mmCIF file of C-alpha atoms in Angstrom:
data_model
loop_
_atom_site.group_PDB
_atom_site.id
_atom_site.type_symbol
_atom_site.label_atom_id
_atom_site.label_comp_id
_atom_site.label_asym_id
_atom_site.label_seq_id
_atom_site.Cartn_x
_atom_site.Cartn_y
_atom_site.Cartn_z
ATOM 1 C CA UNK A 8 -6.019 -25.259 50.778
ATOM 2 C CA UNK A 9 -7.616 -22.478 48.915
ATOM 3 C CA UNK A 10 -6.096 -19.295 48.005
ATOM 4 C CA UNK A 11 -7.888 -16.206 46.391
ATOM 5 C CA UNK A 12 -5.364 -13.023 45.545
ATOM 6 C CA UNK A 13 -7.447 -10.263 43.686
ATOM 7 C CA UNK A 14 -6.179 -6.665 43.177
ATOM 8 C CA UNK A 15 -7.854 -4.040 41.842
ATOM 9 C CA UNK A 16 -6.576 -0.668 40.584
ATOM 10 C CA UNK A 17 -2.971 -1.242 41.329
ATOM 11 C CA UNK A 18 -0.840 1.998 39.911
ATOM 12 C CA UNK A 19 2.864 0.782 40.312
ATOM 13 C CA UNK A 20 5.979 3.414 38.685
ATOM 14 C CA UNK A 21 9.627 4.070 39.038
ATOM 15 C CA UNK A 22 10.577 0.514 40.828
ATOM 16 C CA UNK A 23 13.515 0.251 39.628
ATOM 17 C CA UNK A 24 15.295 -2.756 41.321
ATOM 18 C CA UNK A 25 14.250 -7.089 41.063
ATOM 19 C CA UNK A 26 10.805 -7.490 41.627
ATOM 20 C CA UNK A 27 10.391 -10.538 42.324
ATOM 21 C CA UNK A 28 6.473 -10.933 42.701
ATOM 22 C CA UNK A 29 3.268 -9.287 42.974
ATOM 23 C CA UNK A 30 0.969 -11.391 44.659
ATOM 24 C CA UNK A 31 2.568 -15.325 45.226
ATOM 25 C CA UNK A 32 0.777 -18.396 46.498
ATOM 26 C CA UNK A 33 2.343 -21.676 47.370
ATOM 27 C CA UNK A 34 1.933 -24.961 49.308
ATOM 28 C CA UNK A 35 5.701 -24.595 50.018
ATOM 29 C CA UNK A 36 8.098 -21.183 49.938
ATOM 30 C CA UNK A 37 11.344 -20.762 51.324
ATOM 31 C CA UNK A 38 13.640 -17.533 50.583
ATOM 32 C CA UNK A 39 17.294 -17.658 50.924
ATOM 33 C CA UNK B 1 -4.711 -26.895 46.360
ATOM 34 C CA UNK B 2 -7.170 -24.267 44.813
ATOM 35 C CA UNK B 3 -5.478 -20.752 43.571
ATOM 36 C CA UNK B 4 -7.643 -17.703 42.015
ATOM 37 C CA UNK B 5 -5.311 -14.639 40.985
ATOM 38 C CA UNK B 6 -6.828 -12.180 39.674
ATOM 39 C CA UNK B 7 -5.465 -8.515 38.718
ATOM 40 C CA UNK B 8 -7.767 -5.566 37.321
ATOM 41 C CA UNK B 9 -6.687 -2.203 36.137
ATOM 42 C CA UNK B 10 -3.448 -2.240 36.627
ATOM 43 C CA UNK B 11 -0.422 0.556 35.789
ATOM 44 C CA UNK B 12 3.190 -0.290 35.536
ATOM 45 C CA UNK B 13 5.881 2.408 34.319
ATOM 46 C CA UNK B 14 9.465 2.917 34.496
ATOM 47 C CA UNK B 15 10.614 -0.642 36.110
ATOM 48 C CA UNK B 16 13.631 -1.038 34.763
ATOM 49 C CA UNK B 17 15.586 -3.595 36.649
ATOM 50 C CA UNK B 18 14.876 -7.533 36.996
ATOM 51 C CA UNK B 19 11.221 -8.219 37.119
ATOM 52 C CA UNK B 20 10.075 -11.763 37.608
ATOM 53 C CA UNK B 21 6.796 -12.560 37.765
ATOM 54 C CA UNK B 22 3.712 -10.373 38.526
ATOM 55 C CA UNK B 23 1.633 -13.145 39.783
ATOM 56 C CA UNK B 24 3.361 -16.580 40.924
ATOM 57 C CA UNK B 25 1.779 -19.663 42.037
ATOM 58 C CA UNK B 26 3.198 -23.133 42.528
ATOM 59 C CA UNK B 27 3.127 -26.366 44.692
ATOM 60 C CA UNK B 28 6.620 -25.307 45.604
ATOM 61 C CA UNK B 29 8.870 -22.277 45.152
ATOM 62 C CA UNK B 30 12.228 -21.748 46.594
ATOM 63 C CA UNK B 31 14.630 -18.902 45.992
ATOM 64 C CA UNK B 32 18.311 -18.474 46.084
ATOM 65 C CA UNK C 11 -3.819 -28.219 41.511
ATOM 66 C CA UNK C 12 -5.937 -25.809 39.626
ATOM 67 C CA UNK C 13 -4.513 -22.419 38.953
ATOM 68 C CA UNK C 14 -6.753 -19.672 37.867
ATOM 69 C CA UNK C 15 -5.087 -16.709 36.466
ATOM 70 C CA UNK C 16 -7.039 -13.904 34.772
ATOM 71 C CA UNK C 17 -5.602 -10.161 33.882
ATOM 72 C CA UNK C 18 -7.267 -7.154 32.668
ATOM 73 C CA UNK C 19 -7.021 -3.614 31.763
ATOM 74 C CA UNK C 20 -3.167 -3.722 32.291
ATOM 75 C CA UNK C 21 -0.803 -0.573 31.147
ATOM 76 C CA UNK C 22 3.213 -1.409 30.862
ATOM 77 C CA UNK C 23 5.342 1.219 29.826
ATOM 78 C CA UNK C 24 9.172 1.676 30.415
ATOM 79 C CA UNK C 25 10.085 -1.602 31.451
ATOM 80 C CA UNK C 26 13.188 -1.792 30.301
ATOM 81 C CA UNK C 27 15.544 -4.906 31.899
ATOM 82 C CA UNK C 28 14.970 -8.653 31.910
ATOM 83 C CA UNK C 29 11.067 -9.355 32.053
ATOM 84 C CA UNK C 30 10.797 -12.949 32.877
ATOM 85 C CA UNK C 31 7.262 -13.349 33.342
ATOM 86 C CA UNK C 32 4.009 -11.721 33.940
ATOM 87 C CA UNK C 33 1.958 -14.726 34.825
ATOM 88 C CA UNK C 34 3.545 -17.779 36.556
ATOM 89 C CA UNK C 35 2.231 -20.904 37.347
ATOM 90 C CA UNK C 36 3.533 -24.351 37.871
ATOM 91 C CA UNK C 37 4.227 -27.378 40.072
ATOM 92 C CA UNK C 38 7.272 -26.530 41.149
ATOM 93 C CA UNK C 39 9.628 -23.589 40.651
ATOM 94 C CA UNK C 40 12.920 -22.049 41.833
ATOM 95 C CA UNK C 41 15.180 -19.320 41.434
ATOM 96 C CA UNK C 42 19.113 -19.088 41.915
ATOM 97 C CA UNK D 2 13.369 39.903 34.591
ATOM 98 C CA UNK D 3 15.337 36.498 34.056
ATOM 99 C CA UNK D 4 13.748 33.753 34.898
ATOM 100 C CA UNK D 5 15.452 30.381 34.725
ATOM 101 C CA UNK D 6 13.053 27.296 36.028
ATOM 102 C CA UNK D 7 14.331 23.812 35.746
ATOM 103 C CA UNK D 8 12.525 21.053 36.717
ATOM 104 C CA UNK D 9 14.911 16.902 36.510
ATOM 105 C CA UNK D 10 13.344 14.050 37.783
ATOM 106 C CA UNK D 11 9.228 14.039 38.675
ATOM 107 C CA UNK D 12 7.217 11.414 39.234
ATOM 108 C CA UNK D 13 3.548 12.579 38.831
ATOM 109 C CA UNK D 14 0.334 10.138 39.487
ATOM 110 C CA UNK D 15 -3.565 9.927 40.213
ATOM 111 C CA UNK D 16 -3.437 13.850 40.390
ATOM 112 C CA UNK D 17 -7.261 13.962 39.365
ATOM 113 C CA UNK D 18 -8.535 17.281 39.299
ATOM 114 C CA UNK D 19 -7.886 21.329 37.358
ATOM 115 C CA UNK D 20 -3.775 20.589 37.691
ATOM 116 C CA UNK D 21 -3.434 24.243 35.753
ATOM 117 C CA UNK D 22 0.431 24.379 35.442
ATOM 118 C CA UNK D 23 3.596 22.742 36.530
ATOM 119 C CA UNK D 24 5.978 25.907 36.134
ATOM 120 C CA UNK D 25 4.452 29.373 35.644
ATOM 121 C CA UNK D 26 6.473 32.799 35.090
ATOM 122 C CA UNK D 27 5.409 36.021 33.719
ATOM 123 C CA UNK D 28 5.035 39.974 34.148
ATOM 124 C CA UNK D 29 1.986 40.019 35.945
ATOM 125 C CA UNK D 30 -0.713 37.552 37.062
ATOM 126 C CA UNK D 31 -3.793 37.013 38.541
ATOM 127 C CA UNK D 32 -6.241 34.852 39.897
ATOM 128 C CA UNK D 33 -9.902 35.085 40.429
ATOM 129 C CA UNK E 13 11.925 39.551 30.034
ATOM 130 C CA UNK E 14 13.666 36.106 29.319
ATOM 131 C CA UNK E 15 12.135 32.410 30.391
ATOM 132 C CA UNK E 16 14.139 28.764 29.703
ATOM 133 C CA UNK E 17 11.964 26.176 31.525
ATOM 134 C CA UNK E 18 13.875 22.833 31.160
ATOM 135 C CA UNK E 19 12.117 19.740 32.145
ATOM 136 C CA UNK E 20 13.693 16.330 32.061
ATOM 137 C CA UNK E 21 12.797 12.927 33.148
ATOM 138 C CA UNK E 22 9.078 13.431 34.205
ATOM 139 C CA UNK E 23 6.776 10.636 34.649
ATOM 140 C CA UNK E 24 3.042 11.331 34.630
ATOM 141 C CA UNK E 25 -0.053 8.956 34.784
ATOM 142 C CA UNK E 26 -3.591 8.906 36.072
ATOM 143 C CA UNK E 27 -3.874 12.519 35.667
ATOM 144 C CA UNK E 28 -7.693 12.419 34.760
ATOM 145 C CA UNK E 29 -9.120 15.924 34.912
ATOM 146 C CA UNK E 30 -8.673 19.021 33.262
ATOM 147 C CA UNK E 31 -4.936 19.038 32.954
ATOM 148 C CA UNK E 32 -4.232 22.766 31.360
ATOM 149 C CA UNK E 33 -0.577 22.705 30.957
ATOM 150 C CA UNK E 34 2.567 21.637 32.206
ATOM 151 C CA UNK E 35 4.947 24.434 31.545
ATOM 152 C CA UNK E 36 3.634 28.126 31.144
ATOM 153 C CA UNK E 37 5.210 31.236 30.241
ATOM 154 C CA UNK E 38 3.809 34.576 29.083
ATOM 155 C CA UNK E 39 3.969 38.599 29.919
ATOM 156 C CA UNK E 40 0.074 38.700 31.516
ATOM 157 C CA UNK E 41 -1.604 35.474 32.303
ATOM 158 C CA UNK E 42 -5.225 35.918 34.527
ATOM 159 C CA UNK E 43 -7.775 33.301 35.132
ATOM 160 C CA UNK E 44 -10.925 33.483 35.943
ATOM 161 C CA UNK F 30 10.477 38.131 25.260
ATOM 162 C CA UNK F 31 11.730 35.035 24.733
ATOM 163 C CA UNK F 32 10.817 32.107 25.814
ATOM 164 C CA UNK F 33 12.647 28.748 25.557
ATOM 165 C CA UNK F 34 10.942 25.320 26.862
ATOM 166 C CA UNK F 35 12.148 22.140 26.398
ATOM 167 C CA UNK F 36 11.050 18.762 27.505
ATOM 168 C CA UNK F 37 13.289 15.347 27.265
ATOM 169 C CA UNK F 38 12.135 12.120 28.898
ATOM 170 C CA UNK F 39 8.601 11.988 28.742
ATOM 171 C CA UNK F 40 6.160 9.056 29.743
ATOM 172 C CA UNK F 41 2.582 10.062 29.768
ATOM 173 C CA UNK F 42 -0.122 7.309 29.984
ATOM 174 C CA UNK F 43 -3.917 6.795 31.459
ATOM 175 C CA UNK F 44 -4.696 10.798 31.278
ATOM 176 C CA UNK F 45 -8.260 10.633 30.126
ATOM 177 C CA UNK F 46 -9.728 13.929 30.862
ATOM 178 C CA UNK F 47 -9.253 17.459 28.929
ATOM 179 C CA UNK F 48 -5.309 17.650 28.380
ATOM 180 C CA UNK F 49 -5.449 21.233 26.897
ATOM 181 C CA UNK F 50 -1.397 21.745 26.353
ATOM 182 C CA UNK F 51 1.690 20.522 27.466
ATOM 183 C CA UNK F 52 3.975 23.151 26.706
ATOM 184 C CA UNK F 53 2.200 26.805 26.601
ATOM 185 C CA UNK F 54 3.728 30.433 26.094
ATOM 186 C CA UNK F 55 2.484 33.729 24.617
ATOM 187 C CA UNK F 56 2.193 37.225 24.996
ATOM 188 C CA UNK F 57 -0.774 37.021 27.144
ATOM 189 C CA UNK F 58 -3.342 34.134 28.234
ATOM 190 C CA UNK F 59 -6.753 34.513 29.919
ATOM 191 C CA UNK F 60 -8.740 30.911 30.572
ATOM 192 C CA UNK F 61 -12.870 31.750 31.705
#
């Protein structure tokens, strides 16, 4: 398993609420 | 398990609330 | 499990809450 | 002449350019 | 001749350019 | 004239450029 997240000139404002994550990556991930 | 995250020129303003994590990585992440 | 995390050129302004984490890595994690 | 402008709540990004003015009032005016 | 420009709350970012003014008021204003 | 301007609440960030004024007023203005 390889994983490769890349962001580049991101402009992110007034998000106001629970941000959990930008950019995840897991073996495993389960949201309840 | 390989993970590369990478973030460039980034811009974040007025968030105000709960934020975790910008970039997350694990073997295993649940959330409840 | 190799995690790679790299930042740059990051602006954070008005982030006013409960900031856990900008970066995040480990072998396991969870949220309740 | 009254002029009452009121401007609550703006959210202004990547507005790249020869942005001259947000509110504007006078007499006269003109462009060319 | 009166003029009240209010502003409140204003957010601005990335606004690379020639950014003149936000708020403008005047009897004769001309540009050329 | 008068001329009232007020500004409350102001987050400004990443405006590389020319910013000539924020806040302008006068009797009269001519830009070439």
């Amino acid at each position: 398993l390889i994983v490769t997240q890349t962001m580049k000139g991101l402009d992110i404002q007034k998000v106001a609420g629970t941000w959990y994550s930008l950019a995840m990556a897991a073996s495993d991930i389960s949201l309840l």
